[PDB]
Amino acid sequence: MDAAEVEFLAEKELVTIIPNFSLDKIYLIGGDLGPFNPGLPVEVPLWLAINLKQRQKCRLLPPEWMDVEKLEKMRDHERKEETFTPMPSPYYMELTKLLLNHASDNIPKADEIRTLVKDMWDTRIAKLRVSADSFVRQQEAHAKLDNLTLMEINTSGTFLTQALNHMYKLRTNLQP
Amino acid sequence: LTPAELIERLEQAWMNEKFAPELLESKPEIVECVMEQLEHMEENLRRAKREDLKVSIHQMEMERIRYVLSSYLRCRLMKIEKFFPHVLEKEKTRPEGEPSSLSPEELAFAREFMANTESYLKNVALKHMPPNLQKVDLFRAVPKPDLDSYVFLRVRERQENILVEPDTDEQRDYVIDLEKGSQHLIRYKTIAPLVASGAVQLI
Amino acid sequence: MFVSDFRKEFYEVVQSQRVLLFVASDVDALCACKILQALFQCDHVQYTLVPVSGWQELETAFLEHKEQFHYFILINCGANVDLLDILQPDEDTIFFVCDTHRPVNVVNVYNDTQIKLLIKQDDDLEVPAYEDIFRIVEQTMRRRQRREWEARRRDILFDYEQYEYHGTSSAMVMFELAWMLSKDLNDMLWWAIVGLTDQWVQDKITQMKYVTDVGVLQRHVSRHNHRNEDEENTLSVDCTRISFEYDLRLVLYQHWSLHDSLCNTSYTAARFKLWSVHGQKRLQEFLADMGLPLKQVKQKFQAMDISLKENLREMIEQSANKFGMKDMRVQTFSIHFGFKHKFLASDVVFATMSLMESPEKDGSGTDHFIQALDSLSRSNLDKLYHGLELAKKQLRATQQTIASCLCTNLVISQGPFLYCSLMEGTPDVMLFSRPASLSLLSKHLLKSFVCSTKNRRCKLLPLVMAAPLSMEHGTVTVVGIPPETDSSDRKNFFGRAFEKAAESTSSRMLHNHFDLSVIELKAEDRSKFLDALISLLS
Amino acid sequence: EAYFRVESGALGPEENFLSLDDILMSHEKLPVRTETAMPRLGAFFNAVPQGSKLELPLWLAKGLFDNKRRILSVELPKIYQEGWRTVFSADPNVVDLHKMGPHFYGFGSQLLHFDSPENADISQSLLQTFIGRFRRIMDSSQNAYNEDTSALVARLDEMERGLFQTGQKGLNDFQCWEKGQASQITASNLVQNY
Amino acid sequence: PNALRFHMAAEEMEWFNNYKRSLATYMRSLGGDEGLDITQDMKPPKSLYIEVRCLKDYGEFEVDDGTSVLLKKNSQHFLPRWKCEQLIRQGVLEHILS
């Protein structure tokens, strides 16, 4: 894969907007939406909230896990534990990039949410290169990754698997 | 099979083909039953086109689905053109009652591809050779798929008693179990029949 | 005709069509486009953007596209001449004009089918009434009266089309439109402010009108940016903020040093007479009267010590009363994006105006236009930050020419108007070869001159300037600027003079641009033209 | 992006037929001692004695080999001898596997089809060298951005450069997504001609 | 373009024109109406319209409804990205407003 398709899979998460136009139910091949009552919340998939925000037709809302207090506890829980701890949403990096870039003025304290998210990320990446070094160092044959999201996997996967194949080969070249 | 679930299963059929090291199962049902929603909702837009916002909300979703599907197909016409002889053989000797790994149309494409390349190599360098080398067999020139690759997977049907062979020493094999929703990093050979049975999905 | 309301007469017609946008080349028109773009990309309206540069290229462009489309939009071009003939269009084609030039041509006003005008009629317009300019012995007895009518027409024309000037900028009409629809943002407000500031920078509007328009725009600025009353602590730092400033008139002093921007603003480089060693010490005394070390003033402004810059913008306004410079603070706006991004609305202008008119040419006429249109969106701060090193290089190569024609006295008093000319051998004279970057040099030359000379006659005569255009064709370019003063109405009158002079002498001339006061003339018809012009103006 | 060259099987049981890496790999020379005479072909090195030390490509010595050592026997180069097998154990992060190459793991895995005695000690050198040089390719390839990497890559071989070019292609692809840069559609192979 | 069809040996053109034809045969077989052209669509779709800017001359690009468009140099349009993909990926147009 590549980041630009993880970003595609991440635009299926649901968010809540507040439209300012009138429209009746829409029957999408992936569900139903609406109705859109001006000045009333409604829950849509991201790829539509962003596209409506760019055309000046809505007003986003911060997801509940995107609070500057619960995050300041996740950031500590992550540094205490010694394994991959569970995360608010399986796609938090892409959410807190797309949202904070496109709707940073409808989110209060954007430039602290952003730094806490980055602090969590910079740790969950450090635990990986330790869990991906003991693997080689001790020549394991299995490794249980607990709560890795698809993005951390995809940033260093096409190197790790490709450097473990060359190790299986070198380790089983004497049998015949 | 609500039209809402075809897409949820299509994305899953889309990731596996991207990560697997071998040409996986053939799903003719879905590829032929999503080309129906596309073929239908392309008509209820060109007819009732006299709205200017609804048609946009529909065209965007159609364009997302027509990319999932398309990039899924392209990802298999790469497996076929890299493994054409080994994928023809496997389909010729298939025991009846086993899901094919080739559509009836990919099969024609693969037949024509093998024919074309053989008829090309026959007239450039395999013709002007001494008259005992002019035949080269394409089961020992095209490398077979490599099913000793490592993959990340996340499981969604609790499995137990899974064999983990680190090396050639049959003794060193410790059996493991799998929870639900967990994620592991294991070789593709030991979990081959699980991807075909929906028990896992290569993330 | 005149469009009464922009919603239901201009927008909601082209809302469902495929329009074609012709664009002139000046910061005002760039900023008037970049709003219409953003108003089309928001409603999915297929447009097309053709950058033109004269009348020949506008005609060439209309040649090719005139059958596919049948809607058109001209921006800062084609309101001071007649349109239904230079283009010779069909009947079912529509033209919208959103130009600033004045006065609007006559027929373009009594043609309510093909040429609609987006010009707010509450400008300074006084268009003559309809039949005053448009259509047995008793036969002759009344056709003599019709001859009298024609004679009155020949006069009222000369009354109405004698002075050229400019109205409200395009980028303010478009912004009124974009606010009607309720689809305005800050990004569409900054382009309004820049498209307005540019006219006042190039000195095409009066100070009264400029302050009136600033008074208008400040309500919008406060409506947007005041909604953050006390939450300015929980607003994202990476989100643009526009603010009203009462700030200095020095050019580019926040990126240059404080010293190299006093020596180059053509408003303190005139008073201080910073071209004659006798008065260069005036600058020294001005600096010493404030306690600014001569070593901090020479260093870049962002690195100057923090203890000096506290009340700089006041200790400069004060110590400029003691020298005879009382108009030193102007009213402008400024923008902050993020951590280090802070622009005054007259830095964007001098950078854009010099990306579009870079001397070294790298292709067709529409290769620089694109690079300057690019540097107005925030995703391209690497061109702006680059177009600020051309705007510097230009300003340091203008006070080294106004220093030539004033330590050599190349301003001839040829009678009713001054006169000058340039030499190729002087360095940095190929930079001003363009017929657009020559008006500013002349308009600063006049400002330095009027302050320099000791006469009382020359201080109130318009200037006329010529500099060589093409060595192969052997031709020069000529401009004409109104008589300078503090409260000049800015109503130039040379578009008629040069026309009639070339008509009298019957020489070869080209009125290629959209403004009339710029002409290309054979190097040999110079005197043949000039003498007849001297006699004509009289 | 769509030109998928045939990869190298030089680490498994036998090299691939069409892979241009293995073709240039096996071409490298190797020392042999002949067991018979070489009639009608002594021109190169007409007949050649028995018990003569010669240098032959690897591909040639594939078929000319048998269990009984009918035609010739083989002895390993010094890079795989006992001498260097201790050097590569002192600290493997110091060796210039490009001069000692440029196919170290590729060659060394084909010298196991000669049933020499010390195979159980070559297949332990390779494994313990590749494991030794890992934490210096996992970290100098995912953490070298907009740098001149032509000096972090001057001491590697074809099995390792292929990984140093996969670390970079995943670093320079996340850093291009973070900066809103992997949204613009670009020319894929035409900018290669330009 | 014939900077390429000049470097292939004269029998590789036959291999090409066979492969291309078999591919275009397979593509039209997928769906009922002329199948689905899987050649386009190489990157996830982001928005519905795109803003391009020409870079070379090109005779007369077509819009499905018979409404052609001339392509002079340095003149930017606002077209559906459903049509511009073929030309952006070659070198003619350019995606500016990223």
PDB file of N, CA and C in Angstrom, chain C residues 18 37 40-41 44-51 64-65 68-69 366-367 370 373-374, chain E residues 47-49 51 53 60 63 67-70 72-80 97:
ATOM      1  N   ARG C  18     -20.690  27.638 -19.906  1.00  0.00           N
ATOM      2  CA  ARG C  18     -19.243  27.465 -20.005  1.00  0.00           C
ATOM      3  C   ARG C  18     -18.669  28.807 -20.443  1.00  0.00           C
ATOM      4  N   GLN C  37     -12.614  33.166  -9.845  1.00  0.00           N
ATOM      5  CA  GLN C  37     -12.237  31.762  -9.802  1.00  0.00           C
ATOM      6  C   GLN C  37     -12.865  31.076  -8.601  1.00  0.00           C
ATOM      7  N   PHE C  40     -16.342  30.389  -8.882  1.00  0.00           N
ATOM      8  CA  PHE C  40     -16.760  29.382  -9.843  1.00  0.00           C
ATOM      9  C   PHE C  40     -16.413  27.973  -9.386  1.00  0.00           C
ATOM     10  N   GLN C  41     -15.252  27.776  -8.772  1.00  0.00           N
ATOM     11  CA  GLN C  41     -14.889  26.462  -8.262  1.00  0.00           C
ATOM     12  C   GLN C  41     -15.753  26.042  -7.087  1.00  0.00           C
ATOM     13  N   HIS C  44     -19.195  24.640  -9.309  1.00  0.00           N
ATOM     14  CA  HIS C  44     -18.933  23.752 -10.430  1.00  0.00           C
ATOM     15  C   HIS C  44     -19.378  24.382 -11.745  1.00  0.00           C
ATOM     16  N   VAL C  45     -18.724  25.482 -12.086  1.00  0.00           N
ATOM     17  CA  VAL C  45     -18.971  26.198 -13.326  1.00  0.00           C
ATOM     18  C   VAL C  45     -17.708  26.124 -14.161  1.00  0.00           C
ATOM     19  N   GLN C  46     -17.785  25.455 -15.304  1.00  0.00           N
ATOM     20  CA  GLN C  46     -16.619  25.314 -16.163  1.00  0.00           C
ATOM     21  C   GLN C  46     -16.264  26.657 -16.771  1.00  0.00           C
ATOM     22  N   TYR C  47     -15.085  27.155 -16.466  1.00  0.00           N
ATOM     23  CA  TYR C  47     -14.619  28.395 -17.047  1.00  0.00           C
ATOM     24  C   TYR C  47     -13.362  28.108 -17.852  1.00  0.00           C
ATOM     25  N   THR C  48     -12.709  29.170 -18.305  1.00  0.00           N
ATOM     26  CA  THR C  48     -11.440  29.064 -19.008  1.00  0.00           C
ATOM     27  C   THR C  48     -10.770  30.422 -18.949  1.00  0.00           C
ATOM     28  N   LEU C  49      -9.479  30.432 -18.682  1.00  0.00           N
ATOM     29  CA  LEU C  49      -8.784  31.658 -18.326  1.00  0.00           C
ATOM     30  C   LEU C  49      -7.745  31.963 -19.387  1.00  0.00           C
ATOM     31  N   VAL C  50      -7.947  33.049 -20.126  1.00  0.00           N
ATOM     32  CA  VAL C  50      -7.047  33.434 -21.205  1.00  0.00           C
ATOM     33  C   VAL C  50      -6.353  34.732 -20.801  1.00  0.00           C
ATOM     34  N   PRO C  51      -5.061  34.716 -20.552  1.00  0.00           N
ATOM     35  CA  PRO C  51      -4.338  35.946 -20.218  1.00  0.00           C
ATOM     36  C   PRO C  51      -3.963  36.724 -21.467  1.00  0.00           C
ATOM     37  N   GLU C  64     -10.076  32.609 -32.116  1.00  0.00           N
ATOM     38  CA  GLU C  64     -10.091  31.153 -32.051  1.00  0.00           C
ATOM     39  C   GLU C  64     -11.276  30.603 -31.273  1.00  0.00           C
ATOM     40  N   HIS C  65     -11.670  31.254 -30.190  1.00  0.00           N
ATOM     41  CA  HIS C  65     -12.680  30.703 -29.306  1.00  0.00           C
ATOM     42  C   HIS C  65     -14.086  31.173 -29.626  1.00  0.00           C
ATOM     43  N   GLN C  68     -17.083  28.038 -30.140  1.00  0.00           N
ATOM     44  CA  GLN C  68     -17.434  27.141 -29.047  1.00  0.00           C
ATOM     45  C   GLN C  68     -18.300  27.854 -28.021  1.00  0.00           C
ATOM     46  N   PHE C  69     -17.740  28.858 -27.357  1.00  0.00           N
ATOM     47  CA  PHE C  69     -18.461  29.576 -26.325  1.00  0.00           C
ATOM     48  C   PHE C  69     -19.423  30.578 -26.941  1.00  0.00           C
ATOM     49  N   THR C 366       2.762  35.568 -21.934  1.00  0.00           N
ATOM     50  CA  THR C 366       1.919  35.014 -20.886  1.00  0.00           C
ATOM     51  C   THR C 366       2.641  33.950 -20.073  1.00  0.00           C
ATOM     52  N   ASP C 367       3.957  34.053 -19.963  1.00  0.00           N
ATOM     53  CA  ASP C 367       4.709  33.171 -19.086  1.00  0.00           C
ATOM     54  C   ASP C 367       4.942  33.769 -17.714  1.00  0.00           C
ATOM     55  N   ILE C 370       1.393  33.932 -15.537  1.00  0.00           N
ATOM     56  CA  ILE C 370       1.046  32.722 -14.812  1.00  0.00           C
ATOM     57  C   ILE C 370       1.800  32.647 -13.500  1.00  0.00           C
ATOM     58  N   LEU C 373       0.131  35.136 -11.081  1.00  0.00           N
ATOM     59  CA  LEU C 373      -1.145  34.631 -10.600  1.00  0.00           C
ATOM     60  C   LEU C 373      -0.945  33.503  -9.609  1.00  0.00           C
ATOM     61  N   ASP C 374       0.157  32.767  -9.732  1.00  0.00           N
ATOM     62  CA  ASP C 374       0.406  31.662  -8.818  1.00  0.00           C
ATOM     63  C   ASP C 374       0.678  32.149  -7.404  1.00  0.00           C
TER      64      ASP C 374
ATOM     65  N   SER E  47     -11.525  14.916  -5.423  1.00  0.00           N
ATOM     66  CA  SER E  47     -12.660  15.792  -5.645  1.00  0.00           C
ATOM     67  C   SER E  47     -13.261  15.466  -6.996  1.00  0.00           C
ATOM     68  N   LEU E  48     -14.328  16.172  -7.351  1.00  0.00           N
ATOM     69  CA  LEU E  48     -15.072  15.843  -8.556  1.00  0.00           C
ATOM     70  C   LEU E  48     -14.649  16.645  -9.773  1.00  0.00           C
ATOM     71  N   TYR E  49     -14.167  17.866  -9.583  1.00  0.00           N
ATOM     72  CA  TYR E  49     -13.610  18.666 -10.656  1.00  0.00           C
ATOM     73  C   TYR E  49     -12.155  18.977 -10.356  1.00  0.00           C
ATOM     74  N   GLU E  51      -8.610  21.399 -11.795  1.00  0.00           N
ATOM     75  CA  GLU E  51      -8.196  22.569 -12.556  1.00  0.00           C
ATOM     76  C   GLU E  51      -6.853  22.303 -13.210  1.00  0.00           C
ATOM     77  N   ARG E  53      -3.892  23.038 -16.496  1.00  0.00           N
ATOM     78  CA  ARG E  53      -3.260  24.159 -17.181  1.00  0.00           C
ATOM     79  C   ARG E  53      -2.366  23.610 -18.275  1.00  0.00           C
ATOM     80  N   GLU E  60      -7.553  19.998 -30.778  1.00  0.00           N
ATOM     81  CA  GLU E  60      -8.862  20.380 -30.266  1.00  0.00           C
ATOM     82  C   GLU E  60      -9.350  19.254 -29.363  1.00  0.00           C
ATOM     83  N   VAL E  63     -15.078  17.425 -25.624  1.00  0.00           N
ATOM     84  CA  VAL E  63     -16.022  17.149 -24.553  1.00  0.00           C
ATOM     85  C   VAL E  63     -17.133  16.297 -25.143  1.00  0.00           C
ATOM     86  N   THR E  67     -18.814  19.570 -27.497  1.00  0.00           N
ATOM     87  CA  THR E  67     -18.432  20.939 -27.165  1.00  0.00           C
ATOM     88  C   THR E  67     -16.919  20.978 -26.990  1.00  0.00           C
ATOM     89  N   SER E  68     -16.212  21.158 -28.099  1.00  0.00           N
ATOM     90  CA  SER E  68     -14.764  21.075 -28.097  1.00  0.00           C
ATOM     91  C   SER E  68     -14.154  22.224 -27.302  1.00  0.00           C
ATOM     92  N   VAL E  69     -12.845  22.134 -27.095  1.00  0.00           N
ATOM     93  CA  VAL E  69     -12.077  23.133 -26.356  1.00  0.00           C
ATOM     94  C   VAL E  69     -10.682  23.200 -26.953  1.00  0.00           C
ATOM     95  N   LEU E  70     -10.254  24.395 -27.336  1.00  0.00           N
ATOM     96  CA  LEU E  70      -8.908  24.574 -27.852  1.00  0.00           C
ATOM     97  C   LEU E  70      -7.914  24.598 -26.702  1.00  0.00           C
ATOM     98  N   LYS E  72      -4.420  26.142 -26.147  1.00  0.00           N
ATOM     99  CA  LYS E  72      -3.216  26.933 -26.321  1.00  0.00           C
ATOM    100  C   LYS E  72      -2.301  26.751 -25.119  1.00  0.00           C
ATOM    101  N   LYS E  73      -1.093  27.282 -25.223  1.00  0.00           N
ATOM    102  CA  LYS E  73      -0.142  27.148 -24.134  1.00  0.00           C
ATOM    103  C   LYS E  73      -0.436  28.151 -23.028  1.00  0.00           C
ATOM    104  N   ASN E  74      -0.296  27.697 -21.782  1.00  0.00           N
ATOM    105  CA  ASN E  74      -0.478  28.521 -20.591  1.00  0.00           C
ATOM    106  C   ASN E  74      -1.869  29.153 -20.574  1.00  0.00           C
ATOM    107  N   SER E  75      -2.858  28.275 -20.507  1.00  0.00           N
ATOM    108  CA  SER E  75      -4.253  28.679 -20.446  1.00  0.00           C
ATOM    109  C   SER E  75      -4.992  27.604 -19.678  1.00  0.00           C
ATOM    110  N   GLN E  76      -5.512  27.942 -18.509  1.00  0.00           N
ATOM    111  CA  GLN E  76      -6.005  26.940 -17.584  1.00  0.00           C
ATOM    112  C   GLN E  76      -7.521  26.868 -17.601  1.00  0.00           C
ATOM    113  N   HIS E  77      -8.039  25.649 -17.564  1.00  0.00           N
ATOM    114  CA  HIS E  77      -9.458  25.357 -17.613  1.00  0.00           C
ATOM    115  C   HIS E  77      -9.922  24.818 -16.270  1.00  0.00           C
ATOM    116  N   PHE E  78     -11.169  24.384 -16.224  1.00  0.00           N
ATOM    117  CA  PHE E  78     -11.741  23.764 -15.037  1.00  0.00           C
ATOM    118  C   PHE E  78     -12.624  22.641 -15.556  1.00  0.00           C
ATOM    119  N   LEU E  79     -12.044  21.467 -15.716  1.00  0.00           N
ATOM    120  CA  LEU E  79     -12.692  20.348 -16.367  1.00  0.00           C
ATOM    121  C   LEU E  79     -12.939  19.222 -15.387  1.00  0.00           C
ATOM    122  N   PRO E  80     -13.832  18.293 -15.712  1.00  0.00           N
ATOM    123  CA  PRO E  80     -13.992  17.106 -14.869  1.00  0.00           C
ATOM    124  C   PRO E  80     -12.770  16.210 -14.973  1.00  0.00           C
ATOM    125  N   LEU E  97      -4.055  23.347  -9.150  1.00  0.00           N
ATOM    126  CA  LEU E  97      -4.668  23.591  -7.849  1.00  0.00           C
ATOM    127  C   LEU E  97      -4.730  22.266  -7.104  1.00  0.00           C
TER     128      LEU E  97
END
